[PDB]
Design a binder for these strands. Structure first.
Lengths: 107, 99, 82, 92, 91, 105, 78, 99
DNA sequence: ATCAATATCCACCTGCAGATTCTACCAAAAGTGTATTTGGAAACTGCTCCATCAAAAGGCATGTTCAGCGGAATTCCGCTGAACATGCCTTTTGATGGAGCAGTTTCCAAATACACTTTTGGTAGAATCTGCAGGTGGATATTGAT
DNA sequence: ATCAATATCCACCTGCAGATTCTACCAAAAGTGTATTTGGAAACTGCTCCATCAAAAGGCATGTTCAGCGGAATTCCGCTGAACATGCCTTTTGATGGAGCAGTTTCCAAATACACTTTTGGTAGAATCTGCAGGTGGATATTGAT
C-alpha cells in the first residue's frame, strides 16, 4: 500500500493536501488531480527558496539556515521577491542598500 | 587636535551596521507598554501572549524601516539629504495611507 | 496606570530605524512625526487583533490574533504561526 | 498541530545535503507553505465559481498557479505539477 | 439575477422622485455584489479561525466590524441586529 | 409571507441565504446570517443612494447617473474609505487644483 | 499602435489629474506605463478566457482580472 | 489684432474643463488596436466583447488620471510645476509598482 | 484705469435615446411541512503560561557643547514648453454577413459515502550532540589633519 | 602625499543553548475496496453580437515664437551630528500563584435533507413616455494690451 505521494513521485504529503482542500471548503468537490498537482507546486517552491537560502547561508559562512538567509534569498530573486512583495519575514532585516547621493567624495 | 569624524561618516557606518543585522531596534519593554496602553484604551482587561507582543514589534519596525526608505527617496527627490515630516507625509500620501 | 508610553520610543531608537532604512540625515521634527505614524499603525492592528480576540470569547490576545489582523491589513507576517 | 516541517527538512536535504535550518526559519518556512497554499486554493476556488463548476481539478489548480506566480516560477511550477499528475495517473 | 429591483425599491424610500440610469444601476449592482463578497469572506475566515462549521449572524457582525469604517460600521450593526430581532419575533 | 418581510426588509433574505451556502463560505449557514447580512446590504445601499440622490439635485438633475454616485462617494470620508480601491466607470474625478498651481493673485 | 495614444489625449488625462505644466519627455514615459498596465491586466484576463475554453475575452474576464490586480471596476459586473 | 493667452491660463481652464466631464479622453480606435496588439502576444486570434474593451479603457484612463495626481504631487514636493519622468518614476516606486 | 477679445453663464427649447409602463409565460425560487442529524454550548477541570515581584549590572538613553555643513533665499539666464492658426488623415457612425458564445441533451468517467485495516507523523521526555555566538588579539583598511 | 587615530576584518577558541536523535504510544491519517451518484465534457444548434467596411465626421500634426520655468551659483544661518559625562531603566535570571486557554463528556436547539406547493423575478416583444443633452442667444465676467 504505497502512498499517493510516492505514487506521484513526491516528497510533500499528497493525502494531507487533498485533505486540507476539503476542510478549507473551496468547492463542493476536489478531484484527485488537484492535490497531486498542488503538493507538487508547493514542493517545487520550497525547493527553490531553500536552494537560494542554502547558498546565502554558505555565503555568510554558516551551516544552519536562519531567517536572514531566507530574507536575503527572497529579496535577491526578482520572482520570489514579487511572490512575497507583501510578506514580512520576521528577523530577516533588509538588504544592504545605500543611495548613491549619500556616499562621500566626488568621482 | 583630538580626532573628530565629520558628519555623515558615522551615519554611513550606522547604515552599514544596522543594515547588516536583524535585531529589533526598539527597547522591548517600552514597546510592550505602548502596546498594552493602546490595547487597553480599546478594551480593558486584556492579556498578551509574549509572541503576540513580538509579532507586533516585528510588524511595526518592518513597517517603519520600509517607510523610512520611501521617505529617504522622497527627500532625495527634492534634492535634499535631510528627511523631513513633509517627506514622510508625501510618502504616506502616495502609499494611500492619508491620500 | 499607563500613560505617555509613546515617548518610550526614544530618539536613539527611531534613529536606528531610519539607519536601517538607509537614511543618512534626520530633521529634528522627524521623531515626533514618527511617533504619530507608529501610533496609528499600532492602533489599526491592535483593534483588528482585539476584534478577533473578543470574537473567540478569549481574554488573551494571541499571536494568531495579531497575524490574522495583519493579513487583513495586507502586512502578512511569516514566523508566528503564519 | 500538524506542520510541513519533516517534508521541508527532506527537500532541504536534497538540495543542500549538509545544511541545517533553525526553528525560527522552519517556522518562516511553514508560514510560507501555508501562505502559498491558501493563495492558490483561493484563486482556484473563485475560478471554479466564475465558471459555475463545483469541483476543483488539476486544471483549476494549474490556472491559479499561472495567475499567482511570476514568469519563470509559474512556467516551472506547471511542469512539476503536470509531471506529478501524469506520474500519479500512469501509476495504477 | 441582479439586485436591481431591490435597489430601485430602496431608492424610492430615500428619494421617491429620483430615478436612476442603467449604467448607474449596474454600478449599484456591482456595489452590492462587492460588499456581499467582502463581508461573506471575512465571516468565512473568522469561522475557520475558531474551527467552527457555521457562519451565524455572530460572524456577519464581527465581519462587519472588521470591514466598515467606524460610523458606517455602527449603523450597519444596528440595522442588522434589528432585522434578526424583528425576524425572531414572528411566526 | 417572505422572510424579508418577517425581517422587515426590502432586500431578498431568501436569495442572500441561497448565495451564502452556494458560495462555499462554511459547511452550514445559520438562519439569521442572511437576515443580518441582507439587513446590512440594504443599509449600505440606502446610504449611497441617499447621498447620490442629493448630488443629482445639486446638479438640477433628477435621475442618478454614474457621476452622481462618484461624487457622493469621494465626498464622504467613510464610503470613500470603503471604496478606496474601486473605480466607478463613468464617474470622473472631483474638481481639485493644487493651491500652488492657482494663478499668482 | 502605442503611438496611437496621442499627445493631446495624454495631455487630457494629465489635466483631469490636475497637471498644469507638462514636460516633453512625459508622453513617452506615459505610454510605457500604460503598456505595462495593459500587459499585466490583459495577461490575466486572457488566462480567464482560456481557462474557460473560449475565444473571446469577455467584459467579465477583464472585471475578474482587474479585481485580482486590485483595480476593482464597477459597471461591467462587481 | 495681436491677441494671446498666457501659459497656464489655458491650462487651468483645461483642468477645470476635464475635471468636470467624465468622458473617456483617449480615442477608442487607437486604444482598441493597442489592446488587441498587446493581447495577441498572449494568445492568438482572439475577440473582444465591445464591453471588455470599454472596461479596459475605463480602467486604464482611471489608473492614469490618478497616477498623474501623485506625479503632480511629486513635482510639487520638489518645488516645481512641470511634471517630469522622474516624478512618475518616484510615484510608481512608492506605490510598490516598481521596486 | 481703459478697450477689446473671448470665455463663461443662464434661460429657454426640443428631439430622441434611453427610461418606463403593460402583459403573458414560467422555471427556478422561496416557502411550508416532516423526520433525522449534529455542531458546538455547557459544565467539570487539567495544565500551560501569563502577570508579577526581586534584584543586580551595565548597556544605553539623556543632556550639553560646539562647529560644520546643508537648506533656503535670491539673482541670472539659456532653453523649452505652450499658445495658435493651418489643413487632411485617421476616427467615428450606421449597415451587414457569420462565427462563436450560450442552451439542450446525452451518458460515462469520476467523485461521493461508508466499512475496515494499516501506516505514521505529532510527541512526552531522555540524553547526547554541535553550530556559532560572543570574547580576544592582531593584521588591514578607512579617515581626517596637515 | 605622510602620518595618527580608529574602525573593520577575521581567523582562532569553546562554553552552551538550541538542534539533532531516539523509544514508543497511536488517535488520527491515509489507504484499500465495494456501492451509488452525477458533474460536466462532447456533439449539435440557434442566434446574438463581433470583425469588417464604406461614408460623413472632426480632432491631431505641425512650425513659430516667446513667456516663463528650472537649475547653476553665491550666501548667511541655524540646526544637526559627533563627542562626552553621567547614571537610570532595561535586560537577565528565577521562582510563583493562578488566570484562563484548552481538552472531554453530555446533549438539544438548530441546521440538514427531501417532498409538495405556491410566488416571483427574469425574459421577451410592443407601445408609450420623458429627463436632458446639445443648440441658440444675449448678458456678463475674465483675461490681456496699453
Amino acid at each position: 500500500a504505497k502512498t499517493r505521494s510516492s505514487r506521484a513521485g513526491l516528497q510533500f504529503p499528497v493525502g494531507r493536501v487533498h485533505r486540507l482542500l476539503r476542510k478549507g471548503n473551496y468547492a463542493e468537490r476536489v478531484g484527485a488531480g488537484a492535490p497531486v498537482y498542488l503538493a507538487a507546486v508547493l514542493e517545487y517552491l520550497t525547493a527553490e527558496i531553500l536552494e537560494l537560502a542554502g547558498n546565502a547561508a554558505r555565503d555568510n559562512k554558516k551551516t544552519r539556515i536562519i531567517p536572514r538567509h531566507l530574507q536575503l534569498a527572497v529579496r535577491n530573486d526578482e520572482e520570489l521577491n514579487k511572490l512575497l512583495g507583501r510578506v514580512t519575514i520576521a528577523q530577516g532585516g533588509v538588504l544592504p542598500n545605500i543611495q548613491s547621493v549619500l556616499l562621500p567624495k566626488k568621482t | 587636535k583630538p580626532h573628530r569624524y565629520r558628519p555623515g561618516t558615522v551615519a554611513l557606518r550606522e547604515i552599514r551596521r544596522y543594515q547588516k543585522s536583524t535585531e529589533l531596534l526598539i527597547r522591548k519593554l517600552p514597546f510592550q507598554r505602548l502596546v498594552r496602553e493602546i490595547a487597553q484604551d480599546f478594551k480593558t482587561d486584556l492579556r498578551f501572549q509574549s509572541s503576540a507582543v513580538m509579532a507586533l514589534q516585528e510588524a511595526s519596525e518592518a513597517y517603519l524601516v520600509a517607510l523610512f526608505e520611501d521617505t529617504n527617496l522622497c527627500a532625495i527627490h527634492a534634492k535634499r539629504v535631510i528627511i523631513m515630516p513633509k517627506d514622510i507625509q508625501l510618502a504616506r500620501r502616495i502609499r494611500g495611507e492619508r491620500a | 496606570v499607563l500613560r505617555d508610553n509613546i515617548q518610550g520610543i526614544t530618539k536613539p531608537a527611531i534613529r536606528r530605524l531610519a539607519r536601517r532604512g538607509g537614511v543618512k540625515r534626520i530633521s529634528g521634527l522627524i521623531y515626533e512625526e514618527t511617533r504619530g505614524v507608529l501610533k496609528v499603525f499600532l492602533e489599526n492592528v491592535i483593534r483588528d487583533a482585539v476584534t478577533y480576540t473578543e470574537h473567540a470569547k478569549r481574554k488573551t490576545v494571541t499571536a494568531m490574533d495579531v497575524v490574522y489582523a495583519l493579513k487583513r491589513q495586507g502586512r502578512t507576517l511569516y514566523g508566528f504561526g503564519g | 498541530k500538524e506542520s510541513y516541517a519533516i517534508y521541508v527538512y527532506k527537500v532541504l536535504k536534497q538540495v543542500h545535503p549538509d545544511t541545517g535550518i533553525s526553528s525560527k526559519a522552519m517556522s518562516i518556512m511553514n508560514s510560507f507553505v501555508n501562505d502559498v497554499f491558501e493563495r492558490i486554493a483561493g484563486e482556484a476556488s473563485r475560478l471554479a465559481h466564475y465558471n459555475k463548476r463545483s469541483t476543483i481539478t488539476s486544471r483549476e489548480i494549474q490556472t491559479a498557479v499561472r495567475l499567482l506566480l511570476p514568469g519563470e516560477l509559474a512556467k516551472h511550477a506547471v511542469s512539476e505539477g503536470t509531471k506529478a499528475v501524469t506520474k500519479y495517473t500512469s501509476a495504477k
